[PDB]
Design a protein around this ligand. Structure first.
Ligand SMILES: CCN(c1ccc(C(C)C)c(OCC(C)C)c1)c1ccc(C(=O)O)cn1
Ligand SMILES: CCN(c1ccc(C(C)C)c(OCC(C)C)c1)c1ccc(C(=O)O)cn1
Lengths: 211, 10, 220, 11
């Protein structure tokens, strides 16, 4: 069983140099991300080594999805978990305007246009979490079965909450490629900051960038 | 993976 | 409208012929020559996808420059379910895991096999579902510079509405099959990006012949 | 730019 009501609870029980502030907010969220996964149904029933693999595989996409949806209220900006606004001009003046525009156009604004609610967001994050392709999983089909139940519950919720939008379920799933693409780009930036060393990187975010 | 192991064990 | 029959016809019309496999030295050079050959048939394929040609010419250029890598990977991945292992190139050559790893592309080759080929063989993805997935990839409204992104988004929504109807009608006992198809697209996006990185490196070294069309796709 | 792709699409 994978009820969307408990997936929504995981979201809300967790909802609170510009590059420097962004990285500090990322480290803050890695701590609350772990508490979010434990609240996802059946995640803690997975083997501990599998929970480590899934969180190391998805943390970047998971956090990008959160601050993007959180920023539906902001215009030409992104609301960080620390309460700080990063406007579009501040990000461009910092040399990250390109990836910043991608988040704004492919995620935030796409989330705002369709009015993606917090239940749908939580299910997409759960789908990202239960990634059966993550290398090293002891039981991939166990994680795949969890993913299928999440999007089964999501499609049921979409036919229930928005019965006049027959294509809304697929529209949600088809934001995941762009999320995967933006996640890989954000990772490249983070490694580049760690290689050059001119950007402070806290402990947990540093641990996610190691082997 | 010191930090991630500790936070998952609770 | 967006009939799946027309999309399926576009797949078979550009499908490689048994002739070519029966008729058939450097692995990477061969793979790159197969990619150049397939880019030409990719243009003919796109013209047979409903409404694609009705888009502005600049949008057709942008959709094909943004999607060609994923579109070609999807083709040779689904094509390779007909054999027990490896990748069948459109030139007829058969790339096995030994040759791929020795040539320096073993990890990306494995990702194709595990995340795309084996999943396609497991769920027995048919060519109609593959064509619809490629058309969804083709109608990417996030492509930068599109003069009319809303129409591209409308066309993508028409494709997967037809895809869901086809899946529920042909495979009524598998209610999640439609979502399972769509959820291979993140892996395709990731494997596409990783494949380009190898291609740009081989181009940089300059010891790999890269024919005209593939060379044009690689230069912005 | 995009010499070949524009030609093939023009047909
Ligand atoms: C995925 C981890 N990450 C995060 C970490 C580093 C970067 C650098 C590329 C700047 C980032 O680039 C965001 C811009 C592209 C918009 C986002 C964050 C940042 C903030 C929050 C948050 O405030 O909730 C969560 N994750
Ligand atoms: C996506 C464009 N590409 C293509 C171009 C270059 C490479 C190099 C990394 C070797 C490639 O590595 C494929 C696997 C070995 C990972 C695939 C091809 C190649 C062949 C065909 C085809 O024969 O259908 C289509 N696209």
């Amino acid at each position: 069983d994978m009820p969307v009501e408990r997936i929504l609870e995981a979201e809300l029980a967790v909802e609170p140099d510009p590059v420097t502030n962004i990285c500090q907010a990322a480290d803050k969220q890695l701590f609350t991300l772990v508490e979010w996964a434990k609240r996802i149904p059946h995640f803690s029933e997975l083997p501990l080594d599998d929970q480590v693999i899934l969180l190391r595989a998805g943390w970047n996409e998971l956090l990008i999805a959160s601050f993007s949806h959180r920023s539906i209220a902001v215009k030409d900006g992104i609301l960080l978990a620390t309460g700080l606004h990063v406007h579009r001009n501040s990000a461009h003046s910092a040399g990250v305007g390109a990836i910043f525009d991608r988040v704004l156009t492919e995620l935030v604004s796409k989330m705002r246009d369709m009015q993606m609610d917090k239940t749908e967001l939580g299910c997409l994050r759960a789908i990202v979490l239960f990634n059966p392709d993550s290398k090293g999983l002891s039981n991939p089909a166990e994680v795949e079965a969890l993913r299928e139940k999440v999007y089964a519950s999501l499609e049921a919720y979409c036919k229930h909450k928005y019965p006049e939008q027959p294509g809304r379920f697929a529209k949600l799933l088809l934001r995941l490629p762009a999320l995967r693409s933006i996640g890989l780009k954000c990772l490249e930036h983070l490694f580049f900051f760690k290689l050059i060393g001119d950007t402070p990187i806290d402990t947990f975010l540093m641990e996610m960038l190691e082997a | 993976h010191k930090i991630l192991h500790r936070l998952l064990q609770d």
